[PDB]
Amino acid sequence: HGFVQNIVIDGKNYGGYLVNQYPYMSNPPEVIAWSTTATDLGFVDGTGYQTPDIICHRGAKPGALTAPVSPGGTVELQWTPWPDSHHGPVINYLAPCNGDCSTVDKTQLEFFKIAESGLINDDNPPGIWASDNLIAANNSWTVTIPTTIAPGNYVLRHEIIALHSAQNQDGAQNYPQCINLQVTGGGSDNPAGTLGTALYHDTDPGILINIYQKLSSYIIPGPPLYT
């Protein structure tokens, strides 16, 4: 359980969607982060993979604001303290807004995977995962925006999948957090995109899995990494 509290881009903080404050406020502030109804700080499990909730989390609506990023620039997402127990991958996708991200229909967004990190080491099952990397970096993740993509407005869908309960059907816990970016530079790729509702299925090999046993491999869920 947790959420993204802050985003660091080009030397300033863009405050996150503080899901334990703003839902209680009813004139809440404008941010680059999508609003959600996930006030339990919880997840979308396999029962929700083909619902709109998977796209940018439960009840999500676009952020009003969009943050410019320098070409090949970093976006650092700062989480609330991630529990060691919640082992699993950290996955990052972009979808083009083809206009202002604040007015997009999230159900039409087509995501391409720009980064994925999975099982890092399995010397002591359940092992060391991308989520443990995030903990070791004091609960932050650095995303580098590719220089080879067509610049424009994009949703960054940033996600931890916790697998501590994933040996049961619909046990995997997805924690998607969306923010609005203005990608800048000279690139031209328009990578093939996947609907939010086709990212994951509740029987995928990296989703329905027992992490407590020795693992010979881990198949990071979602569509193929764009390079």
Ligand X SMILES: *[C@@H]1O[C@H](CO)[C@@H](O)[C@H](O)[C@H]1NC(C)=O
Whether 201 has a binding-site annotation, put simply, is no
* Distance between CA atoms of residues 218 and 101, nearest Å: 33
Q: For residue 43, what are its two tokens?
A: 């997840």
Residue 1 binds Cu ion, judged by CB under 5 A? yes
- Alpha-carbon separation of residue 221 from 57, 132, 187, 218 (angstroms): 17, 18, 27, 9
The stretch near Cu ion (CB under 5 A) out of 1-9, 64-72, 152-160, 192-200 is 1-9
1 binds, among ligand X, Cu ion, none (CB under 5 to 8 A by kind): Cu ion
Q: For residue 209, what are its two tokens?
A: 């899995």
- Which parts of 134-208 are beta strand (E)? 140-144, 152-162, 173-183, 194-195
Whether 169 has a binding-site annotation, put simply, is no
Whether 87 has a binding-site annotation, put simply, is no
Residue 138 binds ligand X, judged by CB under 6 A? yes
Per the listing, tokens 């087509």 go with 110
Are 110 and 95 in contact by the 8 Å Cβ rule? The answer is: yes
List 136, 144, 205, 213, residue binding ligand X (CB under 6 A): 136
Task: Considering only residues 32 through 51, tell me which ones interact with Cu ion, judged by CB under 5 A.
Answer: none
| Least distance in angstroms from the C-beta of 139 to ligand X | 8
Whether 14 has a binding-site annotation, put simply, is no
136 binds, among ligand X, Cu ion, none (CB under 5 to 8 A by kind): ligand X
Could you tell me which residues are annotated as the binding site for O2?
164, 173
Binding site for ligand X (CB under 6 A): 136, 138
